[PDB]
Amino acid sequence: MDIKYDVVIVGSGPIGCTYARELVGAGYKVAMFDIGEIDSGLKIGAHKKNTVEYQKNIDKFVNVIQGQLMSVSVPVNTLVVDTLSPTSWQASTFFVRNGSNPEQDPLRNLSGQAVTRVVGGMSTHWACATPRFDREQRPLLVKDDADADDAEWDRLYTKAESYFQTGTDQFKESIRHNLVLNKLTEEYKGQRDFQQIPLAATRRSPTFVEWSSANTVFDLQNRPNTDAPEERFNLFPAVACERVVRNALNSEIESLHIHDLISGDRFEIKADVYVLTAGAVHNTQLLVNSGFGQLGRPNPANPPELLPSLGSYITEQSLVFCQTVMSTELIDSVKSDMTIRGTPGELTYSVTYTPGASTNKHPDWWNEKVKNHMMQHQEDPLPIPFEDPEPQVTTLFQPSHPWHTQIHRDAFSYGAVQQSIDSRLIVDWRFFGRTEPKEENKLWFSDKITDAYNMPQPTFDFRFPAGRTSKEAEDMMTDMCVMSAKIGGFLPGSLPQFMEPGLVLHLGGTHRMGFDEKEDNCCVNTDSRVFGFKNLFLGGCGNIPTAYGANPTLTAMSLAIKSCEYIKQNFTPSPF
Amino acid sequence: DIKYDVVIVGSGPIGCTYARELVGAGYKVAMFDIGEIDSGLKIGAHKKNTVEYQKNIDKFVNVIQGQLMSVSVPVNTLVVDTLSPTSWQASTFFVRNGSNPEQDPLRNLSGQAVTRVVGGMSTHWACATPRFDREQRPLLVKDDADADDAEWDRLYTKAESYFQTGTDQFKESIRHNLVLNKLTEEYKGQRDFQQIPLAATRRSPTFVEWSSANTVFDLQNRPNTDAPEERFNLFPAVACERVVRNALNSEIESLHIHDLISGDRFEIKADVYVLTAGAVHNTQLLVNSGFGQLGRPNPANPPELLPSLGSYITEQSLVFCQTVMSTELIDSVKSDMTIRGTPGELTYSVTYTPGASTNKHPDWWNEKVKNHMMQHQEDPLPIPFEDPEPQVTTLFQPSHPWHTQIHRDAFSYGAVQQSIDSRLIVDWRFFGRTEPKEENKLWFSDKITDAYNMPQPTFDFRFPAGRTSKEAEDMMTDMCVMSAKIGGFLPGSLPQFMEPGLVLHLGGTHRMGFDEKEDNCCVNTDSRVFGFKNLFLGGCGNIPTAYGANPTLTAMSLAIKSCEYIKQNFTPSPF
Amino acid sequence: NVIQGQLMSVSVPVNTLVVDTLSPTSWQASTFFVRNGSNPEQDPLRNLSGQA
Amino acid sequence: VDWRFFGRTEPKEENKLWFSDKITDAYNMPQPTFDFRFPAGRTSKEAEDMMTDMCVMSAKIGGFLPGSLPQFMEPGLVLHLGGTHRMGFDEKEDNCCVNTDSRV
Numbered sequence A: 001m002d003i004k005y006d007v008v009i010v011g012s013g014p015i016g017c018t019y020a021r022e023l024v025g026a027g028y029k030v031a032m033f034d035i036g037e038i039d040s041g042l043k044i045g046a047h048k049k050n051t052v053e054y055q056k057n058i059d060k061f062v063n064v065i066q067g068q069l070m071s072v073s074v075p076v077n078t079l080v081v082d083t084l085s086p087t088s089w090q091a092s093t094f095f096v097r098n099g100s101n102p103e104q105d106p107l108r109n110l111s112g113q114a115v116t117r118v119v120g121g122m123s124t125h126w127a128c129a130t131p132r133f134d135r136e137q138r139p140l141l142v143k144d145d146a147d148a149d150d151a152e153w154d155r156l157y158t159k160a161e162s163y164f165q166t167g168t169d170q171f172k173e174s175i176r177h178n179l180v181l182n183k184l185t186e187e188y189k190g191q192r193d194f195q196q197i198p199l200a201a202t203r204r205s206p207t208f209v210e211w212s213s214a215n216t217v218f219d220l221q222n223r224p225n226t227d228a229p230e231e232r233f234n235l236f237p238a239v240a241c242e243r244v245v246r247n248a249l250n251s252e253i254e255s256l257h258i259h260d261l262i263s264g265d266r267f268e269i270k271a272d273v274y275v276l277t278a279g280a281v282h283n284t285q286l287l288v289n290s291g292f293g294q295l296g297r298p299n300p301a302n303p304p305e306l307l308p309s310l311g312s313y314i315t316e317q318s319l320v321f322c323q324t325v326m327s328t329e330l331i332d333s334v335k336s337d338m339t340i341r342g343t344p345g346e347l348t349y350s351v352t353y354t355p356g357a358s359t360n361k362h363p364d365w366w367n368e369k370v371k372n373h374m375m376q377h378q379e380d381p382l383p384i385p386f387e388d389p390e391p392q393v394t395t396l397f398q399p400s401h402p403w404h405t406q407i408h409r410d411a412f413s414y415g416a417v418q419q420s421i422d423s424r425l426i427v428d429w430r431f432f433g434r435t436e437p438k439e440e441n442k443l444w445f446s447d448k449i450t451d452a453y454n455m456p457q458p459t460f461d462f463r464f465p466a467g468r469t470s471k472e473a474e475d476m477m478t479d480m481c482v483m484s485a486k487i488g489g490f491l492p493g494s495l496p497q498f499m500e501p502g503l504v505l506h507l508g509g510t511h512r513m514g515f516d517e518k519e520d521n522c523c524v525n526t527d528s529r530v531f532g533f534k535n536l537f538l539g540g541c542g543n544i545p546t547a548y549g550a551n552p553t554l555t556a557m558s559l560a561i562k563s564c565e566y567i568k569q570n571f572t573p574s575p576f
Numbered sequence B: 001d002i003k004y005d006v007v008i009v010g011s012g013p014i015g016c017t018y019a020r021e022l023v024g025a026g027y028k029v030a031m032f033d034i035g036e037i038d039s040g041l042k043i044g045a046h047k048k049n050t051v052e053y054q055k056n057i058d059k060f061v062n063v064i065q066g067q068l069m070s071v072s073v074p075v076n077t078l079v080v081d082t083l084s085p086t087s088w089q090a091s092t093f094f095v096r097n098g099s100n101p102e103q104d105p106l107r108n109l110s111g112q113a114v115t116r117v118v119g120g121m122s123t124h125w126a127c128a129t130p131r132f133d134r135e136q137r138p139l140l141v142k143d144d145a146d147a148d149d150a151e152w153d154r155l156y157t158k159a160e161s162y163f164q165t166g167t168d169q170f171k172e173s174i175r176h177n178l179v180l181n182k183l184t185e186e187y188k189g190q191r192d193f194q195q196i197p198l199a200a201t202r203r204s205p206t207f208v209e210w211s212s213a214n215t216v217f218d219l220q221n222r223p224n225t226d227a228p229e230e231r232f233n234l235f236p237a238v239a240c241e242r243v244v245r246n247a248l249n250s251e252i253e254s255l256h257i258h259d260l261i262s263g264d265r266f267e268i269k270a271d272v273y274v275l276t277a278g279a280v281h282n283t284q285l286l287v288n289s290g291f292g293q294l295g296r297p298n299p300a301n302p303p304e305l306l307p308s309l310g311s312y313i314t315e316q317s318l319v320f321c322q323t324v325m326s327t328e329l330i331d332s333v334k335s336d337m338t339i340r341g342t343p344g345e346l347t348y349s350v351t352y353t354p355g356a357s358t359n360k361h362p363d364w365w366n367e368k369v370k371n372h373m374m375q376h377q378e379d380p381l382p383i384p385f386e387d388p389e390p391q392v393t394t395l396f397q398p399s400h401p402w403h404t405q406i407h408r409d410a411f412s413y414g415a416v417q418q419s420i421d422s423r424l425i426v427d428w429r430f431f432g433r434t435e436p437k438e439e440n441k442l443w444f445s446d447k448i449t450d451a452y453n454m455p456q457p458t459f460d461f462r463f464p465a466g467r468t469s470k471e472a473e474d475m476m477t478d479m480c481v482m483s484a485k486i487g488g489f490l491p492g493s494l495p496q497f498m499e500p501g502l503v504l505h506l507g508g509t510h511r512m513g514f515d516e517k518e519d520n521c522c523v524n525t526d527s528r529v530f531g532f533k534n535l536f537l538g539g540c541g542n543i544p545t546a547y548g549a550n551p552t553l554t555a556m557s558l559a560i561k562s563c564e565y566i567k568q569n570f571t572p573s574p575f
Numbered sequence C: 001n002v003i004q005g006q007l008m009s010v011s012v013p014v015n016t017l018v019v020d021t022l023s024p025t026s027w028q029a030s031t032f033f034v035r036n037g038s039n040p041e042q043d044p045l046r047n048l049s050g051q052a
Numbered sequence D: 001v002d003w004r005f006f007g008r009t010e011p012k013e014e015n016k017l018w019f020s021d022k023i024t025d026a027y028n029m030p031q032p033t034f035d036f037r038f039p040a041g042r043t044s045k046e047a048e049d050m051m052t053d054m055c056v057m058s059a060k061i062g063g064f065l066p067g068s069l070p071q072f073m074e075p076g077l078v079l080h081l082g083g084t085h086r087m088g089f090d091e092k093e094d095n096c097c098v099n100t101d102s103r104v
């Protein structure tokens, strides 16, 4: 380790890797630190799902996700266990056990909130949905000029899409995908439009999809190297970043205080520019541990003096979930162009179609797949081929239906798909609500309790706002039930429900963006620069100040690209 | 150079034993694995050795669950009759979701699973490496028990070095000692309690570097700067499908592989062929090559080559529970303290006399207890929050013919919840020995194939009547009797037999003996396949005995002996 | 089932189970208050909960 | 086959059944409240030896039925409560409520 760099980046997730891509590529001497470790194979920070074995066994990936997500704030447990043997040590009170947080009100939590500490962050296991926000969900980047605002957003989103390798046709040969998309399109009669979920992914074969990750954005290899001989980049894993040291003036950051987890030692690191991309929760913890906002339980008799909006106006999306079992009608419809003679298993059983016939309801390639599956597998009672790729359908947020939707199959911490119903029939429904930012919804940090890395313990004080957020959430639940019925009934064991608050992992607004610190109740400006500080920048979903339902990461990356343009324009790389 | 001195199938710890031996001895080695490097820059290393997992050890259970893929899942017959009327609804229990229609659900090892990753199961195992005593141990020397003992002592010693096995990495756990000392007191000399021998090196009071395949051999391609005269290439994502027999059945001529990334298939040439793909997949590879018999066993048509392959399979019975430490034991932790006043109040104090001969515990223990009780007066227990886990065993003996572990560690089952303090909880796992019986089989379908288009494994297994069954129940009773001395059962973790094969200690699938016919076996004591000059098998599949203790060290020892034979009989090519 | 129906618990302590998947529109408690005939005098850890 | 083993509990003054002066039950009578733990010492040592004896004894007949594994039942489920208005010869010396004619 040198101790002096042009740029230091805290966190190796996709957003940190956005700053690395832009700034290493611009010739800056860059260091990036992550509290977590390299594990994803030789491609550092890559998606863990990109193994042949996971793609042959995609339900097991749910276990990988569950293992790496560490709960943010677990309240004290009050479950009664009164069948201990009389000889066993038996509590007299519900005392603080097993890492729990006594500061946390169990009834005002985001209990599902969790973080991932590994190189590449959560992009080592995410579901890769990268939609754009329309105006209603998005913060303004230009005031009093909507055309210019739309233009700037389209410019940034276009660049973010190419960084992630976002596309909308990787699942276009799936029979299940098309069956569902086409049925929904027909049922809604132009009242709503449906499309493939935009996904950060590149298909490699009919049975393998290279899902994108941080690695896609920046390969995280130390530089200079053979492929980039004039670039300078060093990644330092297993390094807990603990503070950014303020000057007394609060006009500049003077160093970064780090703890090397392997040797145990602490060091101070110097850069011209400091970028914090540690996530929505941990950016905030770092800043609060460094003297921004206020440590301890919020006290309005005693408002912070620096960045008083930090950790207020936090938003998390309401999430509803169910799975369905495909209707008899839609299954029969897969094979509507086949002529069938005889009984499966008999010597003269026959499934045939006429290629190119004007009366066919499906393209030739679909009918070829169906006929071959039915003929080659006469023991199997479905017309859908065994390795048909999954459905990836959406109708995007609109004023008339102000929630994001995903009608798909993918792996999440809660996905448990089971064994008695054939998986070809099963579709997942996830609808995502938008949450109004309210001052009273907070993420704060204990002045007494510490987490496993000896940092102040995160504590939430959150409820979904009454009024619009709550009315929309329940209308959203209703829309899922109404819409999913057009495809099939609910799968027993996956009935319509609200998911534990935060399980969705789309927290925002924890260090929010706006034009004016006071008037827009915010922490950073539209260059993601922290107000008052010449050289401190924050990236991530914690920047997003609006109520949004769609998946936030693409939008956070686009803000990061704009942040990088300010940096390139105002700091000089050191001579190489 | 698609010609090698040695090819090894599988990068788990046993393949890595062959690589360590043979790379070291100057051979041009290639190793293939069907899985991929997914463990960090240390190739094939233990996935538990991250700071984050060691601070969240209970979460590792999810990692193991994720990487164990079931070997044989029978057709599901569960009735779901609450589907909506509009939903497609089956009329029969057809073959769904990759299930194996050949498999009888009542004669399965349903808990059996495999791990396809570089490093194999050593990327997530619990690192217990006991030696087998004579009763559980295969013979290497016939009729000279002193010579047999000496050969095993040498091989095991070398295997323990390879694994970095030790027995005192937990000596400064209060919980460990609390449990060990109480058990030794209660058995009044009938049984010996000691630390589980563990393949691990402690790095700090809160961090242990668990050993893995990586520890045995680093899996870096060679030559490299640290090993300039060595020759090693590792080829991940390569499914190995058949070894080609000459017509004489005296030599292997080729290893046929399928590169999963490019999709292409190749025929690899070596002087020496080593199969170390696990007890299930070594057998699959051999059967797909014409050894044994493909398909449902047929007594009226016994195989001509290797007739014992896939017969005499053994798996251990496993019983498990957790307990909550007794109030007596918790009080005894603080037996040396003088405690006055009430916690949280001004007058409260906890003192002890350092070095006093009337103390039951050493000063390090009393200091830790004193500081915890004084610094955390809101906590009602005397055990420090970061105390390491217990790691206790009494090893298999004639009068108690099961292995025991009295400990905490991560496996695919048995996760904790949050209601009982973790410091009170202890896991009890007792492992039975299974008599080898010709009717217990692992065979492969001639029509159903698995996810890599290879013949589908199918088990025909029940625990033998007689000794095996009687000992399994006596073992359960033993666990109930012993655990009671430490505390009552933890609700939700009551004493139970685990699903057959969850324990993943499968042996005897390609078993070892002196004489193919007389010892009903597939390899000799050099682990060489009878009749074949240049084919060797490594792993637990080789072990032909009824054993209770954890098998991997014993398989590794057998692999070292195999390497000695290779070194005596083949010459490395010129570098 | 007949036995289960006729046995009425003697002392049921206040319930502290967390239910955090209510819809945002549903009335949602701020405290673990005395619900459903429970006994606030009863220490849940010094009970005969099975008594009926 | 079902196995139910029943332990004996030492009578201890501190183990109580009392009645609220504020909370009432469904029949508007004072609400019963327990203050109970199994006594340490003999009651507790016997209870756990008892568990062990069930496991030892039942093994001679068969293994445990999955789903009905050896356990302690919730305190009181057994419905054999005693000593709430206890008998003895002398009210004071035998710490009791009724004499051997069950007269108060």
Ligand SMILES: Cc1cc2nc3c(=O)[nH]c(=O)nc-3n(C[C@H](O)[C@H](O)[C@H](O)COP(=O)(O)OP(=O)(O)OC[C@H]3O[C@@H](n4cnc5c(N)ncnc54)[C@H](O)[C@@H]3O)c2cc1C
Pocket (backbone or CB within 6 Å): A010, A011, A012, A013, A014, A015, A016, A033, A034, A035, A036, A065, A116, A117, A118, A119, A120, A121, A122, A123, A125, A126, A127, A128, A129, A130, A239, A240, A241, A242, A277, A278, A279, A280, A282, A286, A411, A412, A413, A505, A539, A540, A541, A551, A552, A553, A554
């Ligand atoms: C299973 C799952 C599914 C998802 N699906 C989607 C999707 O479909 N679409 C979508 O947009 N979003 C999805 N997400 C969310 C997406 O992964 C996150 O929004 C995104 O990764 C955030 O990027 P980031 O770089 O800001 O933070 P992260 O990805 O969280 O990375 C931040 C990092 O900084 C580190 N760190 C934390 N503290 C410190 C410290 N003190 N010092 C040093 N380093 C530190 C971490 O170890 C970590 O790698 C999903 C997430 C999960 C887990």
Ligand SMILES: Cc1cc2nc3c(=O)[nH]c(=O)nc-3n(C[C@H](O)[C@H](O)[C@H](O)COP(=O)(O)OP(=O)(O)OC[C@H]3O[C@@H](n4cnc5c(N)ncnc54)[C@H](O)[C@@H]3O)c2cc1C
Pocket (backbone or CB within 6 Å): B009, B010, B011, B012, B013, B014, B015, B032, B033, B034, B035, B064, B115, B116, B117, B118, B119, B120, B121, B122, B124, B125, B126, B127, B128, B129, B238, B239, B240, B241, B276, B277, B278, B279, B281, B282, B285, B410, B411, B412, B504, B538, B539, B540, B550, B551, B552, B553
């Ligand atoms: C959670 C758990 C805990 C355990 N704890 C312990 C412990 O405490 N003590 C103990 O002794 N053991 C225990 N074990 C078991 C121990 O892991 C195994 O016995 C040991 O890893 C066997 O090593 P091996 O090299 O023979 O096989 P494996 O580790 O199974 O490796 C064989 C490999 O070959 C591969 N392969 C398979 N088929 C092919 C093919 N066709 N072509 C190419 N490559 C192929 C695999 O991908 C794999 O890497 C545990 C296992 C688990 C999962």
